[PDB]
Swiss-Prot record, chain A:
Protein name per the record: DNA-directed RNA polymerase III subunit RPC1
Location in the cell: Nucleus; Cytoplasm, Cytosol
Subunit structure: Component of the RNA polymerase III (Pol III) (Pol III) complex consisting of 17 subunits: a ten-subunit catalytic core composed of POLR3A/RPC1, POLR3B/RPC2, POLR1C/RPAC1, POLR1D/RPAC2, POLR3K/RPC10, POLR2E/RPABC1, POLR2F/RPABC2, POLR2H/RPABC3, POLR2K/RPABC4 and POLR2L/RPABC5; a mobile stalk composed of two subunits POLR3H/RPC8 and CRCP/RPC9, protruding from the core and functioning primarily in transcription initiation; and additional subunits homologous to general transcription factors of the RNA polymerase II machinery, POLR3C/RPC3-POLR3F/RPC6-POLR3G/RPC7 heterotrimer required for transcription initiation and POLR3D/RPC4-POLR3E/RPC5 heterodimer involved in both transcription initiation and termination.
Encoding gene per record: POLR3A
Tissue: Expressed in the brain, in the cortex and the white matter (at protein level).
Swiss-Prot record, chain E:
Organism in which the protein naturally occurs: Homo sapiens (Human)
UniProt-recorded name of the protein: DNA-directed RNA polymerase III subunit RPC6
Domain-level remarks: The [4FE-4S] cluster-binding domain adopts a globular structure that serves as an interaction hub that connects the POLR3C/RPC3-POLR3F/RPC6-POLR3G/RPC7 heterotrimer to the Pol III core.
Highest taxon listed in the record's lineage: Eukaryota
Function comment: DNA-dependent RNA polymerase catalyzes the transcription of DNA into RNA using the four ribonucleoside triphosphates as substrates. Specific peripheric component of RNA polymerase III (Pol III) which synthesizes small non-coding RNAs including 5S rRNA, snRNAs, tRNAs and miRNAs from at least 500 distinct genomic loci. Part of POLR3C/RPC3-POLR3F/RPC6-POLR3G/RPC7 heterotrimer that coordinates the dynamics of Pol III stalk and clamp modules during the transition from apo to elongation state.
Gene, per the UniProt record: POLR3F
UniProtKB/Swiss-Prot annotation, chain F:
Family: Belongs to the RNA polymerase beta' chain family.
Residue positions binding DNA nontemplate strand: 142, 165
Name of the molecule in the record: DNA-directed RNA polymerase III subunit RPC1
Signal peptide from the UniProt entry: none
Binding locations of DNA template strand: 317, 339
Highest taxon of source: Eukaryota
Subcellular location(s) of the protein: Nucleus; Cytoplasm, Cytosol
Originating organism: Homo sapiens
Sites where the protein binds Zn(2+) 1: 67, 70, 77, 80
UniProtKB/Swiss-Prot annotation, chain G:
Function: DNA-dependent RNA polymerase catalyzes the transcription of DNA into RNA using the four ribonucleoside triphosphates as substrates. Specific peripheric component of RNA polymerase III (Pol III) which synthesizes small non-coding RNAs including 5S rRNA, snRNAs, tRNAs and miRNAs from at least 500 distinct genomic loci. Part of POLR3C/RPC3-POLR3F/RPC6-POLR3G/RPC7 heterotrimer, coordinates the dynamics of Pol III stalk and clamp modules during the transition from apo to elongation state. Pol III plays a key role in sensing and limiting infection by intracellular bacteria and DNA viruses.
GO molecular function: DNA-directed RNA polymerase activity; single-stranded DNA binding
Annotated consequence of substituting residue 290 to K: Loss of interaction with POLR3G and POLR3GL. No effect on interaction with POLR3F
UniProtKB keywords: Antiviral defense, DNA-binding, DNA-directed RNA polymerase, Immunity, Innate immunity, Nucleus, Phosphoprotein, Transcription
Disordered, as annotated region: 160-180
Source organism: Homo sapiens
Protein localization: Nucleus
Name of the protein in question: DNA-directed RNA polymerase III subunit RPC3
Matches recorded under PANTHER family: DNA-DIRECTED RNA POLYMERASE III SUBUNIT RPC3, RNA POLYMERASE III DNA DIRECTED -RELATED
GO biological process assignments: defense response to virus; DNA-templated transcription; innate immune response; positive regulation of innate immune response; positive regulation of interferon-beta production; regulation of transcription by RNA polymerase III
Keyword match Nucleus: yes
Length: 50, 82, 168, 97, 158, 339, 512
C-alpha cells in the first residue's frame, strides 16, 4: 500500500523519495545532498522538526 | 595591513546650491504645507486610549471630533465611515 | 578546579586509570576533583611565509645549496650554512661588494659550518671550485669572522689524517 | 576518538540506530546518541534566528532575545558549516510544552 | 613617428605642459573670435561664417605667438583642437580647399568654432550622495548611514 | 530593590528556515574584516597576524589562550566570523543554475517576465492555492518556464529577446543580435555601422562581426537583478522574505571560525585554500594600478571565479589542461559528501 | 524596486501618518486584493483598513474594480504614489502663468483629493476673503474665469462619473458603483446656482451634486518639456529661436499625441503670422532662420518638405535623447572629471573602439588612461563587445571593443538618485527626532512669549524667557534650520533631472 497511496506506483528510489517525502534533512542525508540544499535555500523552505 | 578608514577622502566636492527667490518661497511653502495639511482628517494618528481614571477634567477639556463625510455614492458597499 | 574542592591546590597534572584524561593536583593527592577531556587530532591526510628575496640573493642561495651537495653530506649542513648566509646578507658592504666576494662567501660559510661539526675538510678542496684565490678568500674569511665575532674550532691534527690516509 | 590504538571506545553505526527504532525505544536512543556521547549546549537569539554566545546576540546588538538549548555537537558544527556556503538555517523558537 | 613621438614626446617623457597650454590658449583665441564675430550682431546667417575660425588662421596665430620653441605643425595643431570637441567646447565646419595657404583637405578645407554647454551643472552633483563613493553601502541599517556618514554632514558645514 | 529577572525559559525548536544572506547582511553578521594574505609574523614566535587569517579575535585553535572576542578558552568558545570582499563580482556555482534560469525567464530590456495578464492571474491564483508543496512548486516552475520560453516578443517594453546559451563552464551568453536564421532585421545595419570605426582601424573584425552575441558577464547580470520589479519577484517561486534575487550573486565571503578548521600538524585545507583567494584578490588589486591591457584583466577575474568555484567543491569537470586542479581538495561539498 | 518603496513609504508616512502607510506599502507590494485577505496579511482590524483605503481612493493612489466571480479588489497606482514631490512645481507653474488665485485653487485641488466646482469655488472664495480686510470681497465671477481658463487649457478636468446606475441593472446592485469617464464633457464646466461672493465662516442645495474635478498633471509634464526645449534652443543660438519654437509648439499642442516622436509640420507662413507682433523679423529672415535651425546637426527640428511654405517638424524623441546624453555627460564630468567626459564622448561617437586606438585621441599617456577606462566598468556606464576571433573564444583571440547604451545608464542612475533623495529626507527626519527635546523646549518658550505678547504685556517676561541655555542653543536650532534649507533646496534641485530622465525613458517604450 505504501508504494501506491499517492495514486501512482512510487518505487524506493532517489526519485521516488523526492516525490514522497518533504522535509529537508532526510533528503540531504540520503543522496544528491548539495543539489537539495541549494534548491531548498533557493525556495526559502521552512522545515518542521517532525 | 591596516584596513582603510570607513570614509575615504574625495577629490571633488558637491556643487553649491543656486539661489532662486520663487524657489525659496516654494522652499518655505513646502515646510509650511507639510505641517499644514497634516490637520486634514485624511491624516490619521492613533485613536485616544488608555486613560488613568475618570476625572471631571476630561469632561471640561474634552476632545471634539465628528465622523468624516466621504462621497457615499462612489465607493463600494462597506464604505460607511462608522 | 585550581583548588581542590576548597583548599590550597593550584597546580594541574594528568593521570587516569583507563584510557582517560584527569587533571592530577597536588595539595590534595587529587585530580583537582575535576579532570577535563583532552581534545586531539589525526586520521586525515615548518612555516611558509617565504620571502620572495632579491633575485641575486637567491642566486647566491642556489650557489650555496649546489656547493655543499658536492660533499653529499647531511642536509643539516646545507640548512645551517643557508641560515648563516641569510645572517650575513644583512649588511651594506656585503650587498655592495663585487659578486666574487659573495662566491667566496658561499664557501667560507660551509667552511665554518663543517668546522662546527668538526667535519674534515681543507681550503684547497673548496677553492678548486669557486675560481678563488688565496688572498681573496682568506681576506674575505678574516673580514667575515671578525665582523660576526663567531667562535669556531681549529683543524685538529688527527681529524684530517683519518680521511687523508684513507685516500691512498 | 577512533579506536583501541587511540582510546576511542566503540562505534554504533546506522544499522543499530535502526534496531533501536525497531524496538521503538525512544529514551534509550536519545540517551545513547546525545546524552552519553557528545551532549553540548548552545545559545540562540529568537529575534533574528541566529546563533550567539555568552548570553548575547552580536547580530541584533541586544540581550533580551537570547536563550540556551541542548544540542548534539555535530549539529552545531553543521549549522556553523552551512553558513560559509551562504545557506542560512534560521531558527524559530517555541514553548517547550 | 612611432619612434619620435613628435614635438610633444620629449626625452621619452610626455610634455603635458606644452599640450595643455596649447589647448587652453587655442580655445582662448577661438572663443575670442566667436565672441567678436557675434558682436557684429547683424545676422545669424553671416555669423554662420564669421563665428568660425580657420585651422590655418589659428595655426598662424599660435605659431605667431611662438610659445613653443619647437615648431608647430598644421595637422599637429588641428588635432590639438580636435580634442576640444570631445572636451565639449567647440564645433566643426568644412568648406572648399581655397581657404588659407594649405587647403588641408582633398578639394576642401575645415573650420572650428566655440560652443555653449546646453545645461548648467545638475542638481544631483550638488548632493553628497551624488558624490558619496560608498553610496551603495551608505544604508540606514548599515554602519554607513545618513545618521553617521561623514561626507553626508560636512556637506552641511561648507 | 531589584527588578524581576526571567532566569530561563524551557524552549524547543519549532522550524528550520533555509534562506540566503545579502552582502549587507553579511557585513552586519561579521565581527572583523581580514585584509592580509600572510598569516604569521616573520619572527621566531610564529605569532598570528592581527588582520590576517587565523586572527585569534575570530576564535581559537589551541589549548593556551582564549579568543580576543569571547574571552574564554577553546573548551567553550563557540566561534566567530570574519569576512572578505572581492574586487569584481563572481558567480556562486551552487546557484549557477538559478542564475541561468532567471536570465532565461526575464525580458532583458525591461526586466519583466513575459507573461499575459491572463497568465498572471492563473499563476497568482495557483500561488493562492492552499497547501502548496515542494513538488507542486516544481510543477509550476516547469509549466511557467514552458509557457515563457516559447515567447519571443515582450508585451511590456515592445521588443523581442534572443535566447540564453552557455559559452563554456562558469560562463553564459545570450543570442540577441546574431545573424538570425529568420533573416536579420534592419537593425543589422545599425550593428554594422557600430563596427565601422573598428573595421576601419582593424579590418580583421569584419570576418567576425557577423558572429556577435550578447557578451553578458557577472557584473552586468548582477546589475540586471538589481532592477527586478518587486511584483515580479515571487513568481520565480522564491519567497521574497527568504532570499531576494540580488543575493544569488556574491561580492563578499565569510571566513568561518578557526574551530571549523583547526590548523595543526600546521596547515589546514580551508585555511590555505582561502589564502589563495585573498592572494589572487590582492594581485588583481595591484593590477588595478598597472596600465595593463584587457586580456590579463578579464583573465585574472576568471581566475578569481575559478578559485571560488574550487573553494566550494572539487570535482568540477570543464577546465582546460593548463590550469587544471593540482590535487584532491576537501571543499565544503566534499566534507558533506560520502560515507 | 526598493528605493521606490523607501521613498514612497516615508513620504506617505509624512503626509498621512504611520497608520495608513503600512496598508499603502503592502498594497504596492501586492497590487490588488479584497479587504479580507488584506486585513489577514496586515493583521489589522476592518475599520482601520477601511479608514485607510477610503483615503487612498479619495486621492486615487488606489483604484477599485469588480473582478471575476464579482470579487472587488483595489489596484495600486505605482506612479501616483510618488508624483507628490512634483506638486511644488505645479504650484510654481500656476502662479507663474496666473495670479495667486490659481495657486490657491490648485493647492486645494490636491489637498482634498477631489472637489465639485461649487465646493471648491466657495471654499477658495471664503479663504480669499480672509486675505483682505475692510469688507473687501472677490466675486465668484473672477474665480470662474480662472477656472474656465484652466479647464480650456486642460490643466484641470472632471473626474470619472458614476454610470446611469439609477436606471440600470434593476434588483440587487453591484458591490461598487464602478465609476466611468468620458472626454465629451471632460473640460465642460457646470452652470452653478450659487451666486455672489465668498462669506466669512462661523467655524461650527447642491446644484453640481457629484460633479467632481481634478488637476491634469500631464498637462504640466507636457509644458515642462516645452520649457526644456525652448530653453535649450535659447541657450544654443539665441532667444529668437526660442520664440519661433514656442510659436510652433503652442500651435502644435493639439496636432499630435502628447508622446508621439514627432509633430505634423506647420508652414513658415503660419509661423510668420503666429509670432508675436513684438518681434520685427521679416518673412525672408524668418525662413532663413528656420533653414539654419533645420540645418543644425543636433536636428531637434527638421524640414520634412516645403508644401504651403517651409515645412518644419519637431523631433521630440531625439531632443530627449540629446538632453539625456548631456545630463549623463555632466554627472560623469563632475563626479570624475572632464577627461572622463572626453573619453566618454570619443566612445559615444566611435561606437566600437579599443584602448590602443584612443590614447592618441585622448592624448593622455599610459598607466593612467587604461585604468581610467577600466574603473568606469565598475559603475556599468561602460560596456565591452569582446568579439572572439575563433570558436575557441580564448582571451588571446578576441577583440575588446568598448560600447555604450544610454538606456541602461538612465535606468541605473535612477537608483542612485532615488536613494540619495531618501537619504536627504531621512537625514532631516533623524536630525529633527534627535532634536525633539530642543524643538519642544523652543516651542514652549516661543508659546510663552506668544502669551502676554501684546495683550496684557509686561516687562518681567520679555527678557527672562530666552536667558537660559537657549542663548547658545537657539543658534543650534537656527543652524539646523539652515541645514534643512540646504537639503530642502537640493530636493527641488535634484528632481528636474529625474523629470527629464523619466520622460526620455517612457518615450523609449513601444508597449507592443
Ligand atoms: S548619507 Fe552618506 S552616502 Fe548618503 S549622501 Fe550623505 S554622505 Fe553620501
Ligand atoms: Zn587541604
Ligand atoms: Zn539576534
Ligand atoms: Zn570566542
Ligand atoms: Zn521587455
Amino acid at each position: 500500500d505504501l508504494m501506491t497511496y499517492k495514486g501512482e506506483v512510487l518505487g524506493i528510489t532517489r526519485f521516488g523519495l523526492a516525490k514522497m517525502k518533504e522535509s529537508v534533512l532526510m533528503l540531504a542525508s540520503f543522496e544528491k545532498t548539495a543539489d537539495h540544499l541549494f534548491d531548498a535555500a533557493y525556495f526559502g523552505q521552512k522545515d518542521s522538526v517532525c | 595591513l591596516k584596513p582603510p578608514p570607513l570614509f575615504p577622502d574625495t577629490d571633488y566636492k558637491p556643487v553649491p546650491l543656486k539661489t532662486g527667490e520663487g524657489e525659496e518661497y516654494m522652499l518655505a511653502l513646502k515646510q509650511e504645507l507639510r505641517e499644514t495639511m497634516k490637520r486634514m482628517p485624511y491624516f490619521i494618528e492613533t485613536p485616544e486610549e488608555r486613560q488613568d481614571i475618570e476625572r471631571y477634567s476630561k469632561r471640561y477639556m474634552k476632545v471634539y471630533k465628528e465622523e468624516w463625510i466621504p462621497d457615499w455614492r462612489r465607493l463600494p458597499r462597506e464604505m460607511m465611515p462608522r | 578546579r585550581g583548588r581542590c574542592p576548597d583548599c590550597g591546590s593550584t597546580e594541574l597534572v594528568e593521570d587516569s586509570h583507563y584510557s582517560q584524561s584527569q587533571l592530577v593536583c597536588s595539595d590534595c593527592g587529587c585530580v583537582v576533583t575535576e579532570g577535563v577531556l583532552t581534545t586531539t587530532f589525526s586520521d586525515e591526510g615548518s612555516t611558509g611565509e617565504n620571502e620572495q628575496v632579491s633575485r641575486s640573493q637567491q642566486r647566491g642561495l642556489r650557489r650555496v645549496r649546489d656547493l655543499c651537495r658536492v660533499l653529499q653530506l647531511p642536509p643539516t649542513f646545507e640548512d645551517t650554512a643557508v641560515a648563516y648566509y641569510q645572517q650575513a646578507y644583512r649588511h651594506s658592504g656585503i650587498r655592495a661588494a663585487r659578486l666574487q666576494k659573495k662566491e667566496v662567501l658561499v664557501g667560507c660559510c660551509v667552511l665554518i659550518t663543517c668546522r662546527q661539526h668538526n667535519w674534515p675538510l681543507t681550503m684547497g678542496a673548496i677553492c678548486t671550485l669557486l675560481y678563488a684565490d688565496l688572498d681573496v678568500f682568506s681576506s674575505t674569511y678574516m673580514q667575515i669572522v671578525k665582523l660576526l665575532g663567531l667562535d669556531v674550532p681549529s683543524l685538529c691534527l688527527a681529524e684530517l689524517v683519518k680521511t687523508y690516509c684513507s685516500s691512498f | 576518538t577512533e579506536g583501541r590504538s587511540r582510546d576511542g571506545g566503540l562505534r554504533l553505526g546506522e544499522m543499530e540506530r535502526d534496531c533501536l527504532i525497531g524496538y521503538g525505544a525512544s529514551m534509550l536512543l536519545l540517551e545513547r546518541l546525545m546524552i552519553s556521547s557528545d551532549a553540548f549546549e548552545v545559545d540562540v537569539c529568537g529575534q533574528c534566528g541566529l546563533l550567539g554566545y555568552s548570553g548575547w546576540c552580536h547580530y541584533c546588538k541586544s540581550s533580551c532575545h537570547v536563550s540556551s538549548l541542548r544540542i548534539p555537537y555535530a549539529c552545531k558544527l553543521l549549522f556553523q558549516e552551512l553558513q560559509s556556503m551562504n545557506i542560512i538555517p534560521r531558527l524559530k523558537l517555541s514553548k517547550y510544552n | 613617428r612611432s619612434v619620435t613621438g613628435g614635438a610633444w614626446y620629449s626625452d621619452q617623457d610626455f610634455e603635458s605642459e606644452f599640450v595643455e597650454v596649447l589647448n587652453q590658449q587655442c580655445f582662448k583665441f577661438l572663443q575670442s573670435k566667436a565672441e567678436t564675430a557675434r558682436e557684429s550682431k547683424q545676422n545669424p546667417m553671416i555669423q554662420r561664417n564669421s563665428s568660425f575660425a580657420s585651422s590655418h588662421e589659428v595655426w598662424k596665430y599660435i605659431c605667431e605667438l611662438g610659445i613653443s620653441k619647437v615648431e608647430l605643425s598644421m595637422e599637429d595643431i588641428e588635432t590639438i583642437l580636435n580634442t576640444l570637441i570631445y572636451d565639449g567646447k567647440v564645433e566643426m565646419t568644412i568648406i572648399a580647399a581655397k581657404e588659407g595657404t594649405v587647403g588641408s583637405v582633398d578639394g576642401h578645407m575645415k573650420l572650428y568654432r566655440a560652443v555653449n554647454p546646453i545645461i548648467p551643472p545638475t542638481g544631483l552633483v550638488r548632493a553628497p550622495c551624488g558624490l558619496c563613493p560608498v553610496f551603495d553601502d551608505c544604508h540606514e541599517g548599515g554602519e554607513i548611514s545618513p545618521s553617521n556618514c561623514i561626507y553626508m554632514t560636512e556637506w552641511l558645514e561648507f | 530593590k531589584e527588578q524581576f529577572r526571567e532566569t530561563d525559559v524551557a524552549k524547543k525548536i519549532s522550524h528550520i528556515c533555509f534562506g540566503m544572506k545579502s552582502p549587507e547582511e553579511m557585513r552586519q553578521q561579521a565581527h572583523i574584516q581580514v585584509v592580509s594574505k600572510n598569516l604569521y609574523s616573520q619572527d621566531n614566535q610564529h605569532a598570528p597576524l592581527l588582520y590576517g587569517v587565523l586572527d585569534h579575535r575570530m576564535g581559537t585553535s589551541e589549548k593556551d589562550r582564549p579568543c580576543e572576542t569571547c574571552g574564554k578558552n577553546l573548551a567553550d568558545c563557540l566561534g566567530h566570523y570574519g569576512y572578505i570582499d572581492l574586487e569584481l563580482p563572481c558567480f556562486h556555482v551552487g546557484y549557477f543554475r538559478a542564475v541561468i534560469g532567471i536570465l532565461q525567464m526575464i525580458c532583458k530590456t525591461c526586466c519583466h517576465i513575459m507573461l499575459s495578464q491572463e497568465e498572471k492571474k492563473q499563476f497568482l491564483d495557483y500561488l493562492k492555492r492552499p497547501g502548496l508543496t515542494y513538488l507542486q512548486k516544481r510543477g509550476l516552475k516547469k509549466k511557467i518556464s514552458d509557457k515563457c520560453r516559447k515567447k519571443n516578443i515582450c508585451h511590456h517594453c515592445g521588443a523581442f529577446n534572443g535566447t540564453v546559451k552557455k559559452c563554456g563552464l562558469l560562463k553564459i551568453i545570450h543570442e540577441k543580435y546574431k545573424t538570425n536564421k529568420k533573416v536579420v532585421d534592419p537593425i543589422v545595419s545599425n550593428f554594422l555601422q557600430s563596427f565601422e570605426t573598428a573595421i576601419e582601424h582593424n579590418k580583421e573584425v569584419e570576418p567576425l562581426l557577423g558572429r556577435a552575441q550578447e557578451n553578458l558577464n557577472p557584473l552586468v547580470v548582477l546589475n540586471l537583478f538589481k532592477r527586478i520589479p518587486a511584483e515580479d519577484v515571487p513568481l520565480l517561486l522564491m519567497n521574497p522574505e527568504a532570499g531576494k534575487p540580488s543575493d544569488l550573486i556574491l561580492t563578499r565571503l565569510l571566513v568561518p571560525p578557526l574551530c571549523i578548521r583547526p590548523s595543526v600538524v600546521n596547515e589546514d585545507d580551508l585555511t590555505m585554500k582561502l589564502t589563495e583567494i585573498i592572494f589572487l584578490n590582492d594581485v588583481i588589486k595591484k593590477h588595478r594600478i598597472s596600465g595593463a591591457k584587457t586580456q590579463m584583466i578579464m583573465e585574472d577575474w576568471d581566475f578569481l571565479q575559478l578559485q571560488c568555484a574550487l573553494y566550494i567543491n572539487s570535482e568540477l569537470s570543464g577546465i582546460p589542461l593548463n590550469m587544471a586542479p593540482k590535487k584532491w581538495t576537501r571543499g565544503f561539498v566534499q566534507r558533506l559528501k560520502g560515507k | 524596486t526598493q528605493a521606490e518603496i523607501k521613498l514612497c513609504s516615508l513620504l506617505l508616512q509624512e503626509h498621512f501618518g504611520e497608520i495608513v502607510e503600512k496598508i499603502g506599502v503592502h498594497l504596492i507590494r501586492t497590487g490588488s486584493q479584497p479587504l479580507r485577505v488584506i486585513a489577514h496579511d496586515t493583521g489589522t482590524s476592518l475599520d482601520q483598513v477601511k479608514k485607510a483605503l477610503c483615503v487612498l481612493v479619495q486621492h486615487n493612489l488606489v483604484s477599485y474594480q469588480v473582478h471575476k466571480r464579482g470579487v472587488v479588489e483595489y489596484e495600486a497606482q505605482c506612479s501616483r504614489v510618488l508624483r507628490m514631490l512634483r506638486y511644488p512645481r505645479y504650484i510654481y507653474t500656476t502662479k507663474t502663468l496666473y495670479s495667486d488665485t490659481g495657486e490657491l485653487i490648485v493647492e486645494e485641488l490636491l489637498l482634498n483629493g477631489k472637489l465639485t466646482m461649487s465646493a471648491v469655488v466657495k471654499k477658495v472664495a471664503d479663504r480669499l476673503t480672509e486675505t483682505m480686510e475692510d469688507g473687501k470681497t472677490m466675486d465668484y465671477a473672477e474665480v470662474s474665469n480662472t477656472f474656465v481658463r484652466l479647464a480650456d487649457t486642460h490643466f484641470v478636468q472632471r473626474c470619472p462619473s458614476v454610470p446611469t446606475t439609477e436606471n440600470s441593472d434593476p434588483g440587487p446592485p453591484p458591490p461598487a458603483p464602478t465609476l466611468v469617464i468620458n472626454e465629451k464633457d471632460m473640460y465642460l464646466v457646470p452652470k452653478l446656482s450659487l451666486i455672489g461672493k465668498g462669506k466669512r465662516r462661523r467655524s461650527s442645495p447642491i446644484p453640481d451634486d457629484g460633479i467632481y474635478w481634478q488637476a491634469n498633471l500631464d498637462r504640466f509634464h507636457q509644458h515642462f518639456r516645452d520649457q526644456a526645449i525652448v530653453s535649450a534652443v535659447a541657450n544654443r543660438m539665441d532667444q529668437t529661436s526660442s520664440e519661433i519654437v514656442r510659436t510652433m509648439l503652442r500651435m502644435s499642442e493639439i496636432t499630435t499625441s502628447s508622446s508621439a516622436p514627432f509633430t505634423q509640420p506647420l508652414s513658415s507662413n503660419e509661423i510668420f503670422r503666429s509670432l508675436p507682433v513684438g518681434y520685427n523679423i521679416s518673412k525672408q529672415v524668418l525662413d532663413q532662420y528656420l533653414t539654419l535651425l533645420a540645418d543644425d546637426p543636433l536636428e531637434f527640428v527638421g524640414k520634412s518638405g516645403d508644401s504651403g511654405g517651409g515645412m518644419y517638424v519637431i523631433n521630440l524623441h531625439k531632443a530627449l535623447a540629446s538632453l539625456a546624453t548631456a545630463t549623463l555627460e555632466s554627472v560623469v564630468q563632475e563626479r570624475f572629471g572632464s577627461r572622463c567626459a572626453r573619453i566618454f564622448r570619443l566612445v559615444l561617437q566611435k561606437k566600437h573602439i579599443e584602448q590602443k586606438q584612443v590614447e592618441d585621441f585622448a592624448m593622455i599617456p599610459a598607466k593612467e588612461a587604461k585604468d581610467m577606462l577600466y574603473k568606469m566598468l565598475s559603475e556599468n556606464f561602460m560596456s565591452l563587445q569582446e568579439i572572439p576571433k575563433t570558436p575557441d573564444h580564448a582571451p588571446s583571440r578576441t577583440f575588446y571593443l568598448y560600447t555604450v547604451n544610454i538606456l541602461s545608464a538612465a535606468r541605473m542612475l535612477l537608483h542612485r538618485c532615488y536613494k540619495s533623495i531618501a537619504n536627504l529626507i531621512e537625514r532631516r527626519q533623524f536630525e529633527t527626532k534627535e532634536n525633539k527635546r530642543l524643538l519642544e523646549k523652543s516651542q514652549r518658550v516661543e508659546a510663552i512669549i506668544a502669551s502676554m505678547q501684546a495683550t496684557g504685556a509686561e516687562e518681567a517676561q520679555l527678557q527672562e524667557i530666552e536667558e537660559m541655555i537657549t542663548a547658545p542653543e537657539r543658534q543650534q536650532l537656527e543652524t539646523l534650520k539652515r541645514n534643512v534649507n540646504k537639503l530642502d533646496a537640493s530636493e527641488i534641485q535634484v528632481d528636474e533631472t529625474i523629470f527629464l530622465l523619466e520622460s526620455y525613458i517612457e518615450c523609449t517604450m513601444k508597449r507592443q
